[PDB]
Design a protein around this ligand. Structure first.
Ligand code: SF4
Ligand code: F3S
Length: 106
């Protein structure tokens, strides 16, 4: 499974959903997650993220390990997203800010 980590929060570019063959991204107010059962690990999404927020599960930084289980739980509750949309309004002021997990919205 590929995992969306911290820098997606409040950026949510959605470029990643274009390339997903199996449409396993699920959508929150300010973040996207990958559903781990559905991802086939084709890795096509991770060059597409402008925030470079997607990682193969086995490559998630030590300080972002929380996101692996977060993606699994929120994918069970959030709606499927299959079409790119606009980036959040202020997405490039927040691109690159560390510590955005405290802004995540359910
Ligand atoms: S690794 Fe492939 S299947 Fe998994 S989320 Fe990315 S594009 Fe979709
Ligand atoms: S910012 Fe998030 S919405 Fe996709 S393109 Fe990157 S994982």
């Amino acid at each position: 499974a590929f995992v969306v980590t911290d820098n997606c929060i409040k950026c949510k570019y959605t470029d990643c959903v274009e390339v997903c063959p199996v449409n396993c991204f699920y959508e929150g107010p300010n973040f996207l997650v990958i559903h781990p059962d559905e991802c086939i690990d084709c890795a096509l999404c991770e060059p597409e993220c402008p925030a470079q927020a997607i990682f193969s599960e086995d490559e998630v930084p030590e300080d972002m390990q929380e996101f692996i289980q977060l993606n699994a739980e929120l994918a069970e509750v959030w709606p499927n997203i299959t079409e790119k949309k606009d980036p959040l309004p202020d997405a490039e002021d927040w691109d690159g800010v560390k510590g955005k997990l405290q802004h995540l919205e359910r």
